[PDB]
Amino acid sequence: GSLPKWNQPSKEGKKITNLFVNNSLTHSKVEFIPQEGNKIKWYACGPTVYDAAHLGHARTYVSFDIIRRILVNYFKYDVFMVINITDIDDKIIKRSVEEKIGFTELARKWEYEFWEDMKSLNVLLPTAITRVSEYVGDIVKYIEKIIENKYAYVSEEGSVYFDIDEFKKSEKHFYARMEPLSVKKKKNAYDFALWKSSKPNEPHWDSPWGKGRPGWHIECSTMASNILGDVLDIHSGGIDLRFPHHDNELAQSEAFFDHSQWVNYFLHSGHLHIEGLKMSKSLKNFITIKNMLTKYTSNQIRILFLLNKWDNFMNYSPNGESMVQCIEIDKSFTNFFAIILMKIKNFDLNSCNLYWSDADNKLNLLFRQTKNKIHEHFLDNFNTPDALLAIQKLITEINIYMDKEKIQIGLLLEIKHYINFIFDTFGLIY
Amino acid sequence: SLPKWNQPSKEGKKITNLFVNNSLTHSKVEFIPQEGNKIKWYACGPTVYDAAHLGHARTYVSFDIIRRILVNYFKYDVFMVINITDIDDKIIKRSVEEKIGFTELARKWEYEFWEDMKSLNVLLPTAITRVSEYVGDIVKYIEKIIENKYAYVSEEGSVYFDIDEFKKSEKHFYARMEPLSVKKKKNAYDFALWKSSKPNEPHWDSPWGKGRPGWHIECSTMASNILGDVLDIHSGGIDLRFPHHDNELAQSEAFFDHSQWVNYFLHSGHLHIEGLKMSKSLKNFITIKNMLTKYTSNQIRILFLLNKWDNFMNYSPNGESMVQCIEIDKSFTNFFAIILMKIKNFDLNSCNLYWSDADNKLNLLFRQTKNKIHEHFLDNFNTPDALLAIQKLITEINIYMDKEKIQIGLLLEIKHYINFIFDTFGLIY
Numbered sequence: 001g002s003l004p005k006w007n008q009p010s011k012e013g014k015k016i017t018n019l020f021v022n023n024s025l026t027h028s029k030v031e032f033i034p035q036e037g038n039k040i041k042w043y044a045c046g047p048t049v050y051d052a053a054h055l056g057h058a059r060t061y062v063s064f065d066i067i068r069r070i071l072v073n074y075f076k077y078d079v080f081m082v083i084n085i086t087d088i089d090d091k092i093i094k095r096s097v098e099e100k101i102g103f104t105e106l107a108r109k110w111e112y113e114f115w116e117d118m119k120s121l122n123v124l125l126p127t128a129i130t131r132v133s134e135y136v137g138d139i140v141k142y143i144e145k146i147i148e149n150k151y152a153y154v155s156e157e158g159s160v161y162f163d164i165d166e167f168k169k170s171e172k173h174f175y176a177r178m179e180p181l182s183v184k185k186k187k188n189a190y191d192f193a194l195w196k197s198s199k200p201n202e203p204h205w206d207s208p209w210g211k212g213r214p215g216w217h218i219e220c221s222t223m224a225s226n227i228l229g230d231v232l233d234i235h236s237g238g239i240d241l242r243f244p245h246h247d248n249e250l251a252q253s254e255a256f257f258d259h260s261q262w263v264n265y266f267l268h269s270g271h272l273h274i275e276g277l278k279m280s281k282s283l284k285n286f287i288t289i290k291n292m293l294t295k296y297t298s299n300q301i302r303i304l305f306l307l308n309k310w311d312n313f314m315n316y317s318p319n320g321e322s323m324v325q326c327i328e329i330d331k332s333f334t335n336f337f338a339i340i341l342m343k344i345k346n347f348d349l350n351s352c353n354l355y356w357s358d359a360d361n362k363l364n365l366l367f368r369q370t371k372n373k374i375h376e377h378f379l380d381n382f383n384t385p386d387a388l389l390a391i392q393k394l395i396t397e398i399n400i401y402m403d404k405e406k407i408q409i410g411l412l413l414e415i416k417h418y419i420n421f422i423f424d425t426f427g428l429i430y
Numbered sequence: 431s432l433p434k435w436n437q438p439s440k441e442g443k444k445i446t447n448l449f450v451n452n453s454l455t456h457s458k459v460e461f462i463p464q465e466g467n468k469i470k471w472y473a474c475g476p477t478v479y480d481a482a483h484l485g486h487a488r489t490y491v492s493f494d495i496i497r498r499i500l501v502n503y504f505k506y507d508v509f510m511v512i513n514i515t516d517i518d519d520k521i522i523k524r525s526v527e528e529k530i531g532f533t534e535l536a537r538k539w540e541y542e543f544w545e546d547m548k549s550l551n552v553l554l555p556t557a558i559t560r561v562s563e564y565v566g567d568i569v570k571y572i573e574k575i576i577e578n579k580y581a582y583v584s585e586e587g588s589v590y591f592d593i594d595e596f597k598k599s600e601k602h603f604y605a606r607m608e609p610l611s612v613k614k615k616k617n618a619y620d621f622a623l624w625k626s627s628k629p630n631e632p633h634w635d636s637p638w639g640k641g642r643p644g645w646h647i648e649c650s651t652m653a654s655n656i657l658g659d660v661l662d663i664h665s666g667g668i669d670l671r672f673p674h675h676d677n678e679l680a681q682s683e684a685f686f687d688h689s690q691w692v693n694y695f696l697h698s699g700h701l702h703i704e705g706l707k708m709s710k711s712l713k714n715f716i717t718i719k720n721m722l723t724k725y726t727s728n729q730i731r732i733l734f735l736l737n738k739w740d741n742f743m744n745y746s747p748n749g750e751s752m753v754q755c756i757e758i759d760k761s762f763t764n765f766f767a768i769i770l771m772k773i774k775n776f777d778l779n780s781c782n783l784y785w786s787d788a789d790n791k792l793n794l795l796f797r798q799t800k801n802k803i804h805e806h807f808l809d810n811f812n813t814p815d816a817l818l819a820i821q822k823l824i825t826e827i828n829i830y831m832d833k834e835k836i837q838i839g840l841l842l843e844i845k846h847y848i849n850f851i852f853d854t855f856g857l858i859y
């Protein structure tokens with residue numbers, strides 16, 4: 001009644017880690033519970049491929065890459081991830097006439113460069129990549145089912161619009177679950193297009209209602225539903241997408257399956273700001289990922305994001321100001337591996353003593369303690385800023401121990417392997 | 431009349447539903463840490479007077495695999511200690527024959543032992559404890575046992591464990607794991623904690639006279655000092671179960687005057703060759719170095735992955751047993767060759783990425799294989815069936831990669847998972 005309800009998955013038969021995540025469906029941190037076993041079905045909104053990707057895009061896809069690496073590499077969940085490519089869009093159509101190359105060729109160019117930028121940043125590719133151009137037929141079938149369930153109507157011009165009022169009336173459906181307060185051819189202004197009648201000279205596709213294009217949001221419901229099904233464990237995106245885009249996805253999918261909860265956990269990354277405003281192509285304040293990579297390394301850019309909680313906004317000071325700290329941390333990690341590898345290489349079993357000393361025991365106690373601190377940090381909504389700090393403090397103490405104390409060779413190797421494990425989870429390469 | 435075993439409480443512990451073959455219960459029981467997700471683990475090390483052979487490799491590689499499963503796969507926190515027996519009747523005898531010092535001999539063969547372990551991709555333990563470096567702690571340990579009235583001093587200057595006194599206590603049982611295996615001594619089954627040294631043997635000072643540690647006291651002393659009064663895991667070859675390991679439990683119980691020093695005692699089966707344990711005594715042994723001039727580390731580790739860690743295995747020489755290992759290694763190598771190249775050369779610009787029914791079928795088999803292997807590892811580290819699960823998955827990936835249009839992301843995900851399992855096995859491709 002007047003407020004959306006959320007149903008936590010049952011814990012029986014599920015992998016229970018006591019992980020808590022910031023869920024935009026509850027606007028709170030709640031325990032994460034798989035729908036089935038240790039499996040996570042995850043859909044993340046992808047880019048609109050008409051121009052270069054910038055540092056703001058890097059923040060979202062790197063941040064959810066880190067979260068994915070924590071879920072899989074650290075907690076041993078089984079993640080099945082899908083990311084779409086929006087290769088049909090008003091921006092793509094307009095840009096293609098300006099550039100006087102085919103719309104498919106333009107979209108394929110900037111999709112190719114998007115994945116190259118992701119690879120440059122050590123971002124894992126998803127399990128599946130779904131292009132709108134390859135799913136238009138499935139989109140048409142999806143819209144047909146929504147109409148059959150009486151949740152969409154066809155205008156005379158040949159467009160199809162979602163019927164918000166009819167959808168709300170159903171007791172099992174609520175519109176705008178995550179931003180309830182954000183709410184001629186249409187019944188009501190809040191109705192949004194599932195199928196757009198095509199304007200002349202635009203690319204178009206056949207449908208039962210006439211030549212047209214998919215609407216802004218129908219592509220994501222169709223693709224996620226086809227591959228992942230009627231319940232998603234995780235759906236992700238930047239916070240700007242929460243409404244209208246993500247709330248409208250929930251309405252479309254609920255209308256298709258005629259059920260109440262298409263997504264269990266909705267995660268939204270915070271925006272990267274530059275001089276107080278979201279980094280955006282519109283504001284012309286953006287730094288491309290390629291330009292960023294001519295000045296800084298993949299590790300340094302990922303450290304920038306590791307230092308900022310994924311779901312909070314962050315301020316990026318350009319001209320290297322924000323990257324001063326990132327460069328210092330990367331340099332100390334590189335030097336740590338140089339030193340510890342050298343101490344291991346030069347260790348002589350024949351002459352050195354291996355008595356387990358008080359100094360050895362103290363370092364070990366700090367080592368196991370650091371493992372538990374980092375475990376709590378990851379459970380605490382993927383708190384990488386504090387996990388990174390824990391590693392820094394441990395490295396500070398290993399450096400002291402290596403300089404003076406007689407070194408336990410096995411202890412140093414064990415610690416090196418643990419730090420490698422955490423850095424693999426972070427996406428750092430040393 | 432029969433020893434009791436106390437399962438650790440589950441409250442506050444990492445619970446995986448792993449079951450292990452525990453020699454204290456002679457059965458498979460659920461593994462529960464004493465504290466959190468931590469595992470304090472002590473494993474008996476080699477007697478460093480000669481080269482290590484394939485039998486030694488079997489025990490240490492097998493427990494290396496178990497360790498990698500516990501840490502890499504289940505995410506336990508393992509604190510492992512391995513001793514080096516550098517003072518021993520064997521070392522002393524070998525050192526006089528070769529006319530070199532006892533320490534120089536032990537340091538040579540310790541060095542070759544760790545080099546052989548590294549060659550087999552066996553991880554070093556957290557701590558390495560040499561007896562020569564712990565003699566003083568051994569003396570203090572024996573003093574406490576005497577103070578608790580569980581050991582006595584002979585006239586010659588030896589110290590013997592008092593089995594009869596130890597048994598009498600209701601909180602103590604002697605020979606917990608092999609109960610049926612049981613002049614200067616009260617009873618013949620008493621064993622030395624301290625041996626009075628002949629003036630020509632190497633020796634150390636003590637309250638009872640110049641002597642050497644007994645065969646078993648060193649492990650109780652070292653494990654107790656570093657790990658404490660409760661060990662999550664203690665491991666060794668099956669031959670060590672009695673008298674060596676049962677005597678470790680008695681010594682440590684007498685020291686702490688409690689009832690359970692080890693929660694889980696794991697014993698690897700013997701590698702036999704032509705029906706007899708591979709042994710230096712039988713002169714039937716193959717050194718690890720000799721083995722590595724004929725076969726690779728991967729092939730040798732696959733040999734052990736194909737045999738359950740706690741069962742005996744027979745090794746047929748002249749390559750008979752290794753034919754299967756080489757075929758498996760070759761099929762892994764070619765699988766990685768194809769999938770790595772398909773990933774590297776894949777072109778996103780030109781390829782179509784619709785999620786087809788063939789993609790969905792492979793993916794379903796992929797997730798299914800993940801669960802099969804999880805059950806296999808929980809089933810007392812059943813690596814033979816986990817390895818076969820990987821083989822079956824690879825057969826289907828090969829079919830999919832050759833003809834069907836490939837999902838680049840799905841192939842990468844599958845590659846990373848198989849790397850993950852191979853890291854757990856200790857294979858390198």
Ligand SMILES: Nc1ncnc2c1ncn2[C@@H]1O[C@H](COP(=O)(O)OP(=O)(O)OP(=O)(O)O)[C@@H](O)[C@H]1O
Nearest residue numbers: 012013014015016037038076445446447800801804
């Ligand atoms: N690493 C993993 N790989 C695959 N599946 C896993 C993994 N870890 C946990 N699972 C799944 O987690 C599910 C729940 O098992 P868990 O360890 O949480 O104990 P449980 O719920 O008490 O046991 P059960 O599933 O037998 O009722 C199991 O079905 C198992 O398949």
Ligand SMILES: Nc1ncnc2c1ncn2[C@@H]1O[C@H](COP(=O)(O)OP(=O)(O)OP(=O)(O)O)[C@@H](O)[C@H]1O
Nearest residue numbers: 046047048056057059060237238271272279280281
């Ligand atoms: N400045 C930013 N900080 C963090 N995430 C961002 C930022 N800008 C965009 N994102 C996220 O990156 C992804 C890009 O998808 P989107 O469809 O918005 O791209 P685009 O339209 O090409 O770019 P832009 O939003 O700059 O116009 C979305 O998840 C969006 O939330």
Ligand SMILES: Nc1ncnc2c1ncn2[C@@H]1O[C@H](COP(=O)(O)OP(=O)(O)OP(=O)(O)O)[C@@H](O)[C@H]1O
Nearest residue numbers: 017018371372375441442443444445466467505507
């Ligand atoms: N990967 C890990 N790294 C470090 N410690 C871990 C790890 N996994 C589990 N632990 C430890 O295992 C302990 C067991 O608790 P677990 O998370 O399994 O749930 P619980 O016992 O039901 O909860 P609680 O710990 O709150 O009593 C945790 O407190 C944590 O200290």
Ligand SMILES: Nc1ncnc2c1ncn2[C@@H]1O[C@H](COP(=O)(O)OP(=O)(O)OP(=O)(O)O)[C@@H](O)[C@H]1O
Nearest residue numbers: 475476477485486488489667700701707708709710
């Ligand atoms: N054939 C074998 N198969 C499996 N494990 C073995 C074999 N031989 C020895 N081991 C184990 O290897 C380790 C070697 O330690 P140990 O003190 O017995 O070595 P050693 O005396 O030099 O060798 P050997 O037992 O051949 O005389 C022990 O854990 C022992 O149980």
Ligand code: NA
Nearest residue numbers: 168170171173
């Ligand atoms: Na309603």
Ligand code: NA
Nearest residue numbers: 240242243244
């Ligand atoms: Na918004």
Ligand code: NA
Nearest residue numbers: 597599600602
């Ligand atoms: Na008794």
Ligand code: NA
Nearest residue numbers: 669670672673
């Ligand atoms: Na025996």
Ligand SMILES: [Zn+2]
Nearest residue numbers: 044045046220
């Ligand atoms: Zn979307």
Ligand SMILES: [Zn+2]
Nearest residue numbers: 474475649674
């Ligand atoms: Zn021992």
